[PDB]
Write an enzyme that holds these catalytic residues in place. Structure first.
Site, PDB file in Angstrom:
ATOM      1  N   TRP A   1      31.713 -20.765  12.632  1.00  0.00           N
ATOM      2  CA  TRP A   1      31.447 -19.414  13.107  1.00  0.00           C
ATOM      3  C   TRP A   1      32.405 -18.991  14.208  1.00  0.00           C
ATOM      4  O   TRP A   1      32.886 -17.857  14.220  1.00  0.00           O
ATOM      5  CB  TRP A   1      30.000 -19.287  13.595  1.00  0.00           C
ATOM      6  CG  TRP A   1      29.659 -17.909  14.047  1.00  0.00           C
ATOM      7  CD1 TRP A   1      29.428 -16.826  13.257  1.00  0.00           C
ATOM      8  CD2 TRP A   1      29.526 -17.456  15.398  1.00  0.00           C
ATOM      9  NE1 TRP A   1      29.148 -15.726  14.031  1.00  0.00           N
ATOM     10  CE2 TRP A   1      29.201 -16.087  15.349  1.00  0.00           C
ATOM     11  CE3 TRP A   1      29.639 -18.079  16.643  1.00  0.00           C
ATOM     12  CZ2 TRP A   1      28.994 -15.328  16.501  1.00  0.00           C
ATOM     13  CZ3 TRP A   1      29.432 -17.325  17.782  1.00  0.00           C
ATOM     14  CH2 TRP A   1      29.107 -15.966  17.705  1.00  0.00           C
TER      15      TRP A   1
ATOM     16  N   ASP B   1      21.657 -32.491  10.576  1.00  0.00           N
ATOM     17  CA  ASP B   1      22.186 -33.733  10.044  1.00  0.00           C
ATOM     18  C   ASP B   1      23.152 -34.254  11.104  1.00  0.00           C
ATOM     19  O   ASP B   1      24.086 -33.552  11.496  1.00  0.00           O
ATOM     20  CB  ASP B   1      22.890 -33.484   8.703  1.00  0.00           C
ATOM     21  CG  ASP B   1      22.994 -34.740   7.840  1.00  0.00           C
ATOM     22  OD1 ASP B   1      22.462 -35.799   8.231  1.00  0.00           O
ATOM     23  OD2 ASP B   1      23.605 -34.659   6.751  1.00  0.00           O
TER      24      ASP B   1
ATOM     25  N   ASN C   1      33.718 -26.376   2.059  1.00  0.00           N
ATOM     26  CA  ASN C   1      33.059 -27.675   2.136  1.00  0.00           C
ATOM     27  C   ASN C   1      33.770 -28.639   3.080  1.00  0.00           C
ATOM     28  O   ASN C   1      33.125 -29.457   3.719  1.00  0.00           O
ATOM     29  CB  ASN C   1      32.998 -28.275   0.726  1.00  0.00           C
ATOM     30  CG  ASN C   1      32.249 -29.594   0.680  1.00  0.00           C
ATOM     31  OD1 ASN C   1      32.776 -30.596   0.214  1.00  0.00           O
ATOM     32  ND2 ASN C   1      31.034 -29.595   1.184  1.00  0.00           N
ATOM     33  N   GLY C   2      35.099 -28.517   3.158  1.00  0.00           N
ATOM     34  CA  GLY C   2      35.910 -29.515   3.836  1.00  0.00           C
ATOM     35  C   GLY C   2      36.672 -29.092   5.072  1.00  0.00           C
ATOM     36  O   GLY C   2      37.360 -29.926   5.640  1.00  0.00           O
TER      37      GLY C   2
ATOM     38  N   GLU D   1      25.427 -24.113  -1.871  1.00  0.00           N
ATOM     39  CA  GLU D   1      25.066 -24.513  -0.510  1.00  0.00           C
ATOM     40  C   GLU D   1      23.562 -24.474  -0.283  1.00  0.00           C
ATOM     41  O   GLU D   1      23.018 -25.339   0.405  1.00  0.00           O
ATOM     42  CB  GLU D   1      25.745 -23.598   0.523  1.00  0.00           C
ATOM     43  CG  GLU D   1      27.248 -23.794   0.654  1.00  0.00           C
ATOM     44  CD  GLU D   1      27.624 -25.184   1.122  1.00  0.00           C
ATOM     45  OE1 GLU D   1      26.780 -25.875   1.733  1.00  0.00           O
ATOM     46  OE2 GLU D   1      28.798 -25.564   0.893  1.00  0.00           O
TER      47      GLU D   1
END
Ligand SMILES: [Mg+2]
Lengths: 121, 122
Positions: free
Chosen positions: B45, B29, B94-95, B18
């Site tokens: 979070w 982003d 990641n997903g 990461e």
């Protein structure tokens, strides 16, 4: 929880909401279509609604003509809660004649990828 | 790192994947911020139980951020049908909650295992 109301060029009104009590990263959202007949009270005449899964949080709503009938479809864009931030989206047709219907789905798009292009290809 | 269902080596590999395992701060982003060692976003979070004082402060702490990852996997991984090892946990990270079932995270897992010391990490 996400809530947004939009007036369509036809005068119909749509709301989009995330499901109540759900986590941030996953769950559902709904799209509700109203006639908008009385502009003083634009949510008074419900027509139809649909509930769909969401893989992440709703990031934005777009109104754009995808099918070329010169009326906008609704596009609901969802951002994955994972580090990859992958985009998914559902498109809906909505008009006085036919009502509210899904039109297409895409998912697993990179963050900066054009969702609209993906929905048209 | 924080203990829990994810192994220490797996957490290290995810950290390296990461951020090169550094406190890199928050990066934008698409109008969305991802922060810190594990590149955690606000939604992540919130769902990992809001450890620490706030999202950005937690994300900047190796311990708090990894606790968040541990809590996220405890909440989601089993119930998504994920294998309870790094292939599953990395792909969830990641997903999202069903990352381990989405093709979009396959490259991430393939690449993470190219990091020195991470091949076939469990
Ligand atoms: Mg159209």
């Amino acid at each position: 929880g996400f809530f947004k109301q939009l007036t369509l060029p036809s005068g119909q009104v749509v709301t989009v909401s995330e499901g109540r009590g759900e986590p941030a990263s996953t769950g559902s959202y709904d799209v509700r279509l109203y006639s908008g007949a009385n502009p003083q009270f634009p949510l008074d005449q419900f027509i139809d609604g649909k509930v769909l899964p969401r893989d992440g949080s709703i990031k934005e709503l777009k109104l754009l003509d995808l099918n070329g009938d010169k009326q906008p479809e609704l596009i609901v864009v969802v951002e994955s809660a994972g580090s990859g931030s992958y985009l998914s989206a559902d498109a809906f047709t909505l008009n006085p004649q036919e009502g509210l219907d899904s039109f297409n789905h895409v998912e697993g798009l990179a963050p900066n990828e054009d969702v609209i292009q993906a929905l048209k290809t | 790192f924080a203990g829990g269902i994810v192994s220490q080596r797996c957490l290290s590999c995810i950290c390296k994947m990461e951020s090169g395992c550094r406190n890199v701060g928050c990066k934008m982003d698409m109008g969305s911020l991802s922060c810190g060692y594990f590149q955690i976003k606000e939604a992540y979070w919130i769902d990992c139980g809001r450890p620490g004082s706030s999202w950005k402060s937690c994300a900047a702490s190796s311990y708090c951020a990894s606790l968040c990852v541990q809590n996220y996997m405890k909440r989601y991984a089993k119930w998504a049908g994920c294998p309870l090892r790094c292939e599953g946990f990395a792909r969830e990270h990641n997903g999202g909650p069903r990352g381990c079932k989405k093709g979009s995270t396959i490259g991430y897992w393939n690449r993470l295992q190219k990091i020195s010391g991470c091949h076939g990490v469990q």
